[PDB]
Symmetry: D2
């Protein structure tokens, strides 16, 4: 599934995730968000299970983007946790957490949760 | 906060997170879980906001561990999203998502959510 | 939106949510899950914002089901948090948390997170 | 555990949750938040597993508050999912989701996640 994961993915928001999966579990790449306080591409890094089971289960993975690049600093970071499912309609199904830098008093309002689905077309 | 983040952290479960923060936002390191289907150390990678605001807000960050190393393969990955708060009781406050590889039919039961707090002592 | 919310909704799993919205914010009804350790109907109760803004924003709401009825006891409860959006393709968009009764030591593995979308057809 | 749950609970934010647990799984009561856009008391309703297992596992429960009362309308609702653990340091351990009414375009930024722990003292 190194082969399966590596490439360009798109989510339902129009965001673009470009990733290379390394042989021993690394994910590296760039993320471009169609939504929020984001412009251009941001570095991403993450991990995947390089030896998934072969019972039709997906391949567990995750990655993080900190929302800082040369154009913008959104004082926040998102992590996506999910799985890759291969085949003719290959998908990466995720849930994510977006934490923004807040005072310790405003900690309760720091973290958004949502869900993105990534496909190889759009 | 490169300085502040780099080092060894412990959570309320007894887990140990060793991390180096790089100058332009990288987090690399190892994670050893006191809980779950985990043995020894696992690679982690993530990102942090290398230029946080200076109003007392924390520093947004996240990282991922895929639960595969030479000893075990738990067909799963966790991502932690949170923030570093510095000072005499420095903390990394997080929420996490743990996704396990599942059939597409069992997707609804794939992802656990929780929260860990990391400190420099314990 | 009392009118809009009251009725029968279906999610992407084939589950059926029957609800009455009361004038001062109550939600009462029954839930029948197509997934998991569930049979027949279960009581639900919840709340909604009975005076939403009129800028095209949805109507905030939530409800809980404890997974006990005469046929089954799954020692667990789900809560759905989300919003009702009206019109020709009316939707209730939700995120949910499912907590299962666990020992205090297994607390970290107690809570699943996911997302359901409800429609008036299927 | 009807007995155990019924009463007044306090969380780490100073919020106060007053609840009655009914014999067949109902939770009714009032919630007063020390945090956020909240004043005075708000209705809550929820459910609990009225027949938990007796292996030391907690009692699964959840409830919802819509943030509207005579004083304020915050166009939002929170749901808490968690468990009651009895004994000399009785606790209700929760994760919560707070959804705010948003346009369908801003749906991705609608829902906060966090965690509250409730105790019988403070």
């Amino acid at each position: 599934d190194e082969a399966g994961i590596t490439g360009t993915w798109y989510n339902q928001l129009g965001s673009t995730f470009i990733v290379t999966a390394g042989a021993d579990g690394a994910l590296t790449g760039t993320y471009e968000s169609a939504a929020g306080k984001a412009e251009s591409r941001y570095v991403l890094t993450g991990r995947y299970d390089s030896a998934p089971a072969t019972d039709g289960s997906g391949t567990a993975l995750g990655w993080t983007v900190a929302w800082k690049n040369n154009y913008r600093n959104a004082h926040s970071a998102t992590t996506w946790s999910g799985q890759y499912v291969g085949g003719a309609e290959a998908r990466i199904n995720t849930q994510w957490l977006l934490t923004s830098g807040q005072t310790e008093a405003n900690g309760w309002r720091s973290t958004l949760v949502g869900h993105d689905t990534f496909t190889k077309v759009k």
